[PDB]
Amino acid sequence: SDSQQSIKVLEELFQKLSVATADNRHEIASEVASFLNGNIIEHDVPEHFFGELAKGIKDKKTAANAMQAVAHIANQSNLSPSVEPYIVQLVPAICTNAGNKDKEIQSVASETLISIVNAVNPVAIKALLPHLTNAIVETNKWQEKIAILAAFSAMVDAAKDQVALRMPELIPVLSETMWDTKKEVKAAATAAMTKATETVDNKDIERFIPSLIQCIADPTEVPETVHLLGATTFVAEVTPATLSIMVPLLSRGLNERETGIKRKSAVIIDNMCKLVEDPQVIAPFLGKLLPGLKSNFATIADPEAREVTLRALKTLRRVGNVGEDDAIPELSHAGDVSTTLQVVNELLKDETVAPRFKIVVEYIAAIGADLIDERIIDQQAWFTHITPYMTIFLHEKKAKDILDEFRKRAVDNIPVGPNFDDEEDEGEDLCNCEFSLAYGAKILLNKTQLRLKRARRYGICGPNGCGKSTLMRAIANGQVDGFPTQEECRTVYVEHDIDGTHSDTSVLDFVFESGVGTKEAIKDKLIEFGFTDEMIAMPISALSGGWKMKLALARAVLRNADILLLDEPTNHLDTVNVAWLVNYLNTCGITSITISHDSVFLDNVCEYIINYEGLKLRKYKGNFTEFVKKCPAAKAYEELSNTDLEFKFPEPGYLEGVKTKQKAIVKVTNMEFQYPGTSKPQITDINFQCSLSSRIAVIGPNGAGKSTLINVLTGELLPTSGEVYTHENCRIAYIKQHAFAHIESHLDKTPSEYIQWRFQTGEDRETMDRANRQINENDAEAMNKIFKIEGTPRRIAGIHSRRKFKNTYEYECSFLLGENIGMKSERWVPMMSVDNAWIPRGELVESHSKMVAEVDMKEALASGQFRPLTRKEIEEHCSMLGLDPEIVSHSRIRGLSGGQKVKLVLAAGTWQRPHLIVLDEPTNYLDRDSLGALSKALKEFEGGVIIITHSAEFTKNLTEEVWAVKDGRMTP
Amino acid sequence: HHHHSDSQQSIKVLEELFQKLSVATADNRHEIASEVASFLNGNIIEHDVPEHFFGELAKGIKDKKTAANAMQAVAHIANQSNLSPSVEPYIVQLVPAICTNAGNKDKEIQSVASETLISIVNAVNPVAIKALLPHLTNAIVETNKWQEKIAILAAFSAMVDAAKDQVALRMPELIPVLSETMWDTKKEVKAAATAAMTKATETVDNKDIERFIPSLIQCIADPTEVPETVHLLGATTFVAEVTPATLSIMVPLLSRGLNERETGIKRKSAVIIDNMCKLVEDPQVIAPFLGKLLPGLKSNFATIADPEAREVTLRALKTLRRVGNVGEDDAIPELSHAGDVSTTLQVVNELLKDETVAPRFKIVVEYIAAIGADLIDERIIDQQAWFTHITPYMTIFLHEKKAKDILDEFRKRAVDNIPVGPNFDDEEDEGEDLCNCEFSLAYGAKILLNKTQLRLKRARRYGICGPNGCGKSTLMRAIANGQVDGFPTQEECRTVYVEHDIDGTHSDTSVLDFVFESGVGTKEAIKDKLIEFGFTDEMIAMPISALSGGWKMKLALARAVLRNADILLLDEPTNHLDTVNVAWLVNYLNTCGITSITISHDSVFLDNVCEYIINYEGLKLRKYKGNFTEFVKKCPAAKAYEELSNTDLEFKFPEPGYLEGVKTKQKAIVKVTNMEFQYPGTSKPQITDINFQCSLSSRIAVIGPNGAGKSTLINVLTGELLPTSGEVYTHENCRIAYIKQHAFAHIESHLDKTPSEYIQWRFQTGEDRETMDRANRQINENDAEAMNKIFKIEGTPRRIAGIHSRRKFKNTYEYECSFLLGENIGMKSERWVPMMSVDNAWIPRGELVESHSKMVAEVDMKEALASGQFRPLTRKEIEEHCSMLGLDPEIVSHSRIRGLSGGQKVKLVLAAGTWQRPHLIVLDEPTNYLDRDSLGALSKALKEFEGGVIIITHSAEFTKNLTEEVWAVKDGRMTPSGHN
Ligand SMILES: Nc1ncnc2c1ncn2[C@@H]1O[C@H](COP(=O)(O)OP(=O)(O)O)[C@@H](O)[C@H]1O
Ligand SMILES: Nc1ncnc2c1ncn2[C@@H]1O[C@H](COP(=O)(O)OP(=O)(O)O)[C@@H](O)[C@H]1O
């Protein structure tokens, strides 16, 4: 009913929109946008509305209006998941409009495509990309190609990790476009190409990227570029993105004319492909290299070029895991949309999914498929991204039971990759053993192998109690079958030496007694290690944790060690000393084997990881983080990374005048909201109060009145009438699932930089200005927006102060008055203080976000409410939410679990220590596990709480007050 | 003069070596080229040049029969680590002829020429670019042979890597040349030109336009893409300062954009021009480009009807006039010619007017003029910097004293031509103004500042700088107490002089009550902030007398927040703060969102915090955009702020590493007996019957005029030349450091690196690349099919499969190699079969380095680790080592070498050279490139060096009371004299 009311409101607004002019177009699009993205319909979609919107887009007369509405609907912080799939479905029609002969329609279309690319869940890339690639390949309108190429570029910044995996399919498309006959298209294709390459993220070839781009544009530079690439010694993994940029150059290298080049190409091919850890990766590229190699291993005289070629060929076959007769293995279809769709259709066979929800099912499949390519398999991650789409037509419990099953089956398709290859790696082995290990009749390792390379740094991992320390002890004592003797390979178990030196003994005589050389030779090295004469002569009993470690490593050098064995080396060590230890290990030139619960340490030191898997040792090239990507079961160990527990929200900020948690800090009276254009208000005669003790639950089915009440409460919509009292400095944290899904656009940052990103302007960009298109950042000219004040045209000269205006802010603005408008003597003259005026935040942010921010910054400081974004403060804050300091300041979000991302997002949401936390349907995307932790945190929250939900089970023992909207009204 | 015997012997040796050279075949070519190179680059001639030799070389390069041989000699002579300034200008003088050969029909001659140009580019003093570049630009523009163009283009590319800073300043001249070349009909030339262009853009020192570089280059190739390309850059937010490199790439595009038909393109062009150019800080930077922007903008303003496009066009025109300092009637400001070679050339010729400079030295004067012109362009003005670069060329035809006296006058006169340069502008930057004052400052009747101005922006960070004692602290105190005329009252602009507050709190008062007694809010409110800040409940309740230095600083800032401070004032805030607390302060100041003014002797702290530098100049305050490092670029005099006392110039060399079996400083660690060296092809050995010893107490002076014998003796002593006969004993682990002027000048190729990175670069392979293998080309990095070098051992052709160990051999090293035996060499069945250990053989280092450097470095590395002599390149040790040589730790790991003064660069190079803690230091003519101040410090450091010292000098003055042992070569013989 209140839901059926929504359908009507959408009709009135759409009726006004179709009539809209270039003058009022943005005003109504905004209304449609703010209303459509809220909780307005109960388990269904405004089918008729989307139908009219679709139709309107295809008609000249309304193309601009309909599309401009989409751009507003598809803003960066408020696109509702209940709407998202229906917006993406319009991209095709919109691409066509990007090729229209009419300038206005063509421009709005181009604009709308960028808006959509920046608004969708980045993980849903597989539902959007095909529309853009299909379009640019099949169109003959050059302006359309340029608009789609621009949308490709915007996507690189919006979903970098997701795009990276699509590179092998995207690069050839951009390459082909670079050869378009239209010069403008050539120019645009080259630019998008340069943009797309930002996803390679490979230090080894980075500096040659512009040289590869040029080659795509002109083959004649291939020899020149091959000659230019020969020396690149690869270190970092060779990803799909690396190949889509390398192979085409090489392929043309092989089929070159001169023997030298053919040879060079092979070297590069060889050198690069051996670094391909997964066969599925090189699979789609094999066909562009193998033939060129076979043709060469049988057409070039010189026995040098041949040997090279063969080596490459052999590498390709090994790495490619090719089969007999040069047959490329059958690619896995775990990440194919076609596959995940079959799984979801199958799981929905006994559910009657109406026609209008089919598009959603496809979206779900698309998201599921992408999560598989990104190897995101934990339960919370899936609930975070797909559940919200499913409740569009299914009930939460059914959706969740079905979802959990969908992920289990989708995950099982993930192919089991092979193991490292003991043969190839570089260098004289320090040891190469086949052995078993038993500790007190207990088998720790059976018929396993251990090969260590000189100057290489290794880390040993495994489930707690698997025998990590015992193996190390074994290596230290030479109790591994086949291990070299101490004379052949000197091992030093750092800090684990036992002796009988008196606590009186001097540091000098302590080392001397070890029979490691003369006292002169000892002082020499100790000094070189940072020791002073005073320390060398002092009693060992006085050395600190840092100096004992340094002392031990100094002894290692004098002992001429070949392998340094360390066990929890960062224990009792402060940050400067850990940093010192990291630097020393990376530069001492000696092999080291480490066991540490500090993943950050392991990442900074290890080049390889030796993991316990059953009673076998399995090698993995890379640090701990790389290790985890290749071995999921590692995320369940006892490393600093895997540590996850429950959380607590911060204490709200101090408020003067509030002595009792029952005093109202927010009180609204006779409040009413009515969209301009609607027949009657969505909510009226509203009255309510909030306090630090509030425990309110906004219950009921989605509808016009319930959502609008929410939108006025959270600051999105400005009440059309009524009084709003807000205690100075009162802050509200609005928690939506949008932030939880969209954090996937920031996997490249540390939790800390993410929090800095969200509060860049001083306010939460995720929730502030949800009613505005905030895509305006490159608007040098959009700053010339004209404001109409007292009947005169004006431009903003400055913004000086701020003050509360109901449920938002107003800003004092100084102006420039427009004179002789339209004439050759037009000018904008600065006005006097007297003519300054207060202008609502909503009318300023789109064109002057920077000035608004500078002003918000001042007011925050002037009122003592500003919290600095220091690493220390962020770490402290994140600790309360269950995140570890080292991981927050040094680890990339990419390595966090769904649950950890939940903590990070809650931390980011509560960073300003709000007095009122408003949660928007938290059970819609959080599993029982996360719901539990959140429940406790909300019970203990020292500030007010307002939970919007349908789940009564979640509200019991948590809330006590109830808000329910009936016929545009309600009573607390 | 007086005829110099050993010196005349050198002329004779070169003649014999040239005779052998002109006869060499592609087989033995490299062997004698190497001989000519190692000899020519030594101290062989006393104040003159082997004139006839250079004439023969030039005549040989122009002759088909001998072009290959002669150019290959030039190639070996121009190696990356041993090209002598005595020869350098005569080598560059041969470039035009070498270019012509790069376009020769003959396959061999053309190839050798191409290779030689690269060698020369990589061998010259980067600072002498203006002497080499013109040869290359002129050659590529007048030649019609396409292979010659490809070779020169390759040379420009190598230039970018060998002298990046110097090339960046040359971009406005280079880019147009590369662009024309891209329009060459020949398809291989267009590709090569485009590649060179792509390489040149690397001189753009920022990322503002990275994603558009390939588009801009493509645009130059196809100007019809200008309109669309202009549409693409519209979205560029220029942040970094606009330099000559950025302008050279942007202006041609914008200039065409302005002349385009569509009003939309004329408008977009203006917008980009406006945004980019208001980031120009020196009008001389944009002056040569104004003529390509002003007329178009003027024409567009008169032609366009649309008011928006008109306003945009007019706005860009006003920015151009402001930033370009354009005068009346839109006159482009007079171009300073301070950096023109013709300007510095006129200066030196005038200073040399009473000196008779022979025709054969004309090329050197011109070379000296080029170098000076570049020092000025790079704003390198200190005395030591000029002595490092120029003195060595001057002593080719002048005595050291006369050279140094003229050189110092040359520098002063040249530097004096550097233009004034208007102050810097804050207005268009981002901030509301906290203040804007016109004032004077007097302290006890002493004038600190006279009629100057001070404008501070809200939320902006400033650093105050100026010579010691100029008044920085008084100004700050003045600001805090509102004693600067027109400064806002406390109510309008609250300032907090961090940690300089005075009150009467008991040492008993708790932290909470301390803050509370200041009347800054209730106790509840205060507790809320302190906790938010990081204070625990325990600390909030404890006595203030209990806080550490770090928490007092943190408390002080917290109190500033409770007082709602608009401006924070900090005076030497890093004092009494460990690195963790200093890092915390930096972070806080950068994120507190409040304006801050800092005074600090730690330029590194200023670089991490400041956005602007307010500098005391005379009795005026001058503002500069950027942090300290950027400040020093616009104000080079600022590199002498911690100079005032003679003590900051001193340094000490490290203690040589421990050696077993050496219990006295007289114990010989190096002993040579019956030693002789004779170049193959000469009529008689250069030195013979040589005997000598070196110990940790050696204090030797290798005296005498330059010559064949003296130079060869040194070349054997330092390891470059393997003795032809005689015995050499070297104590195990004995290390020698050879300090040559070459390293001091060539560091200008690493201005981008921090001192720490520079040192890591020099010892990347565990050995010093500046002095090791000076007799080898060693420029083989992309040596992949040259590792397929065939070694003839025991009459059988072999390839190296691996190198396994090292052992001492005379004055160098031998390496145990395993081989691949060649079978059916030539046939289709040819193969390289690995041999057994029994066939391994010891091969001298000199024969392996050019083709197997990586493998050799891996062996040297293992021997260093096994002998326990290895020194890890950790930040801590590198800092500890550089501090001994008088360099600050913070500067060594965080500051770019570009910001160091000439005297500081000297400490750094000395630091690099003695990094491995040698037992002997051999200095090659130190007085030739060091000024009085550096010499004094060096003399003291040598006197205290706990290892041996060997000084190759002509100065009896510098050795008096330093050395007592004497080595003087006479007729190929030398017997040590003096005492120890
Ligand atoms: N149109 C919609 N699109 C997406 N989710 C919706 C929609 N309508 C309701 N939901 C979600 O339905 C969830 C509750 O489902 P459930 O309790 O099973 O059904 P009901 O609320 O009718 O008892 C809530 O989390 C709510 O967010
Ligand atoms: N041919 C040369 N080229 C460059 N420098 C030279 C040459 N010959 C000598 N010098 C330099 O001359 C410098 C000063 O010598 P000086 O003392 O003036 O003359 P002399 O040593 O003959 O008494 C020495 O540092 C020496 O390195």
PDB file of C-alpha atoms in Angstrom, chain A residues 534-599:
ATOM      1  CA  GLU A 534      81.270   1.521  25.551  1.00  0.00           C
ATOM      2  CA  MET A 535      78.938  -1.303  24.552  1.00  0.00           C
ATOM      3  CA  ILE A 536      81.662  -3.672  23.418  1.00  0.00           C
ATOM      4  CA  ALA A 537      83.150  -3.443  26.908  1.00  0.00           C
ATOM      5  CA  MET A 538      79.904  -3.553  28.906  1.00  0.00           C
ATOM      6  CA  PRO A 539      78.360  -6.731  30.420  1.00  0.00           C
ATOM      7  CA  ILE A 540      76.049  -8.746  28.138  1.00  0.00           C
ATOM      8  CA  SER A 541      73.400  -8.513  30.854  1.00  0.00           C
ATOM      9  CA  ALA A 542      72.804  -4.889  29.805  1.00  0.00           C
ATOM     10  CA  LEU A 543      72.073  -5.301  26.071  1.00  0.00           C
ATOM     11  CA  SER A 544      68.503  -4.525  25.008  1.00  0.00           C
ATOM     12  CA  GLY A 545      66.331  -6.642  22.741  1.00  0.00           C
ATOM     13  CA  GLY A 546      67.488  -4.708  19.721  1.00  0.00           C
ATOM     14  CA  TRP A 547      71.183  -5.028  20.528  1.00  0.00           C
ATOM     15  CA  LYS A 548      71.051  -8.736  21.292  1.00  0.00           C
ATOM     16  CA  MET A 549      69.552  -9.357  17.844  1.00  0.00           C
ATOM     17  CA  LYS A 550      72.224  -7.198  16.241  1.00  0.00           C
ATOM     18  CA  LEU A 551      74.816  -8.999  18.321  1.00  0.00           C
ATOM     19  CA  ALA A 552      73.556 -12.416  17.181  1.00  0.00           C
ATOM     20  CA  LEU A 553      73.558 -11.388  13.506  1.00  0.00           C
ATOM     21  CA  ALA A 554      77.054  -9.958  13.934  1.00  0.00           C
ATOM     22  CA  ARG A 555      78.152 -13.338  15.302  1.00  0.00           C
ATOM     23  CA  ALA A 556      76.544 -15.000  12.307  1.00  0.00           C
ATOM     24  CA  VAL A 557      78.820 -12.980   9.995  1.00  0.00           C
ATOM     25  CA  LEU A 558      81.932 -13.907  12.002  1.00  0.00           C
ATOM     26  CA  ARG A 559      80.790 -17.541  11.934  1.00  0.00           C
ATOM     27  CA  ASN A 560      80.644 -17.154   8.126  1.00  0.00           C
ATOM     28  CA  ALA A 561      77.051 -18.437   8.035  1.00  0.00           C
ATOM     29  CA  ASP A 562      75.401 -19.653   4.832  1.00  0.00           C
ATOM     30  CA  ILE A 563      71.911 -19.848   6.308  1.00  0.00           C
ATOM     31  CA  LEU A 564      70.331 -17.714   9.008  1.00  0.00           C
ATOM     32  CA  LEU A 565      67.474 -19.439  10.837  1.00  0.00           C
ATOM     33  CA  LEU A 566      65.074 -17.114  12.679  1.00  0.00           C
ATOM     34  CA  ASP A 567      62.063 -18.013  14.904  1.00  0.00           C
ATOM     35  CA  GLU A 568      59.733 -15.158  15.936  1.00  0.00           C
ATOM     36  CA  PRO A 569      62.580 -12.610  15.451  1.00  0.00           C
ATOM     37  CA  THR A 570      60.310  -9.588  15.869  1.00  0.00           C
ATOM     38  CA  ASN A 571      59.374 -10.532  19.436  1.00  0.00           C
ATOM     39  CA  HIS A 572      60.419  -7.932  22.024  1.00  0.00           C
ATOM     40  CA  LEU A 573      61.504  -5.658  19.165  1.00  0.00           C
ATOM     41  CA  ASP A 574      60.201  -2.116  18.573  1.00  0.00           C
ATOM     42  CA  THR A 575      59.402  -0.664  15.137  1.00  0.00           C
ATOM     43  CA  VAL A 576      62.795   0.902  14.432  1.00  0.00           C
ATOM     44  CA  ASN A 577      64.544  -2.359  15.272  1.00  0.00           C
ATOM     45  CA  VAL A 578      62.163  -4.449  13.181  1.00  0.00           C
ATOM     46  CA  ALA A 579      62.744  -2.052  10.285  1.00  0.00           C
ATOM     47  CA  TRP A 580      66.478  -2.417  10.915  1.00  0.00           C
ATOM     48  CA  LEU A 581      66.146  -6.236  10.862  1.00  0.00           C
ATOM     49  CA  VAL A 582      64.110  -6.164   7.640  1.00  0.00           C
ATOM     50  CA  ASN A 583      66.697  -3.992   5.924  1.00  0.00           C
ATOM     51  CA  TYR A 584      69.553  -6.237   7.090  1.00  0.00           C
ATOM     52  CA  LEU A 585      67.922  -9.466   5.924  1.00  0.00           C
ATOM     53  CA  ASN A 586      67.138  -8.034   2.484  1.00  0.00           C
ATOM     54  CA  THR A 587      70.742  -6.869   2.079  1.00  0.00           C
ATOM     55  CA  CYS A 588      73.078  -9.226   3.932  1.00  0.00           C
ATOM     56  CA  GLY A 589      73.293 -11.441   0.856  1.00  0.00           C
ATOM     57  CA  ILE A 590      72.781 -14.606   2.864  1.00  0.00           C
ATOM     58  CA  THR A 591      69.914 -17.094   2.774  1.00  0.00           C
ATOM     59  CA  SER A 592      67.506 -16.835   5.692  1.00  0.00           C
ATOM     60  CA  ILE A 593      64.604 -18.990   6.829  1.00  0.00           C
ATOM     61  CA  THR A 594      61.978 -17.376   9.030  1.00  0.00           C
ATOM     62  CA  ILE A 595      59.013 -18.478  11.136  1.00  0.00           C
ATOM     63  CA  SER A 596      56.820 -15.560  12.201  1.00  0.00           C
ATOM     64  CA  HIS A 597      53.252 -14.794  13.237  1.00  0.00           C
ATOM     65  CA  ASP A 598      53.864 -11.277  11.817  1.00  0.00           C
ATOM     66  CA  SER A 599      52.659 -11.425   8.205  1.00  0.00           C
TER      67      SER A 599
END
